[PDB]
Structure 1
Amino acid sequence: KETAAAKFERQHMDSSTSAASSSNYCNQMMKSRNLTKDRCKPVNTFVHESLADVQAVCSQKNVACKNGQTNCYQSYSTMSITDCRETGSSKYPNCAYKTTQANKHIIVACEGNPYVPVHFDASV
């Protein structure tokens, strides 16, 4: 079974590229990471930092989660990320996405022992 921590890595980690996400990066990645299986997942962010650096965020700046829970953490440093946002003309199963690279602080929700990221909450 896929753990919550594993699902976060599949949905949100892409350490293999620095940023250089082409204009088709999201179209490709949303498909390959299986986020277009039952529906076009409308928004999803990939983090291009090492897994260790992202996992380390769980011991960084504690902040409120968008849902009001208190287990979210904001990175002290900006991180290379790519936001994927479904286009207006996108039609399942042919999910289409706008690919936007940025450098921003991430906010993740962390849970468990070991305490690791399980949701991507926001970037600021």
Structure 2
Amino acid sequence: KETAAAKFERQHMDSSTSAASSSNYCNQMMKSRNLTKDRCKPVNTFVHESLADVQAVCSQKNVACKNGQTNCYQSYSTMSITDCRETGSSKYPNCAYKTTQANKHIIVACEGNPYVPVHFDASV
């Protein structure tokens, strides 16, 4: 029932803050977005731009996806993001993450009709 498009919004959209509100950000957000459910998701990126701006990336710079598919797109403008990376001492169910804020171009995979983001591939 959760569409792929909806899952992308759950995993990767946080339009509510301009930047990572705190060294705590990742611990709180991975948990509440259900990314520490069955395992600690090792790496995950949140984007702090509007939904419209992030959906519009599917019409921007077409680039190869890390997996070799052709349906990835790089943003022309930089975007405000937060990178969440599991710590060395992190142990499920107490998943712990380092939080890093940045401004970078994002790369997303897009699929469907309508053609919308479904995976976060990379930042550059």
The Cα of 1:53 is off from its aligned counterpart by 0.2
Contact 1:58 1:73 in 2 (8 A): yes
Unaligned ranges ≥5, structure 2: none
Unaligned ranges ≥5, structure 1: none
The Cα of 1:21 is off from its aligned counterpart by 2.4
> Identical aligned pairs, as a percentage?
100
Q: How many residues align?
A: 124
Greater than 3 Å deviation, 4+ residue runs: none
TM-score normalised to the size of structure 1?
0.99
Contact 1:60 1:73 in 2 (8 A): yes
Contact 1:13 1:48 in 2 (8 A): yes
Deviations 1:19-70 (A, max 9, x none): 0420000000000000000000000000000000000000000000000000
Contact 2:20 2:82 in 1 (8 A): no
Contact 2:75 2:107 in 1 (8 A): yes
State the Cα RMSD in Å. 0.4
TM-score normalised to the size of structure 2?
0.99
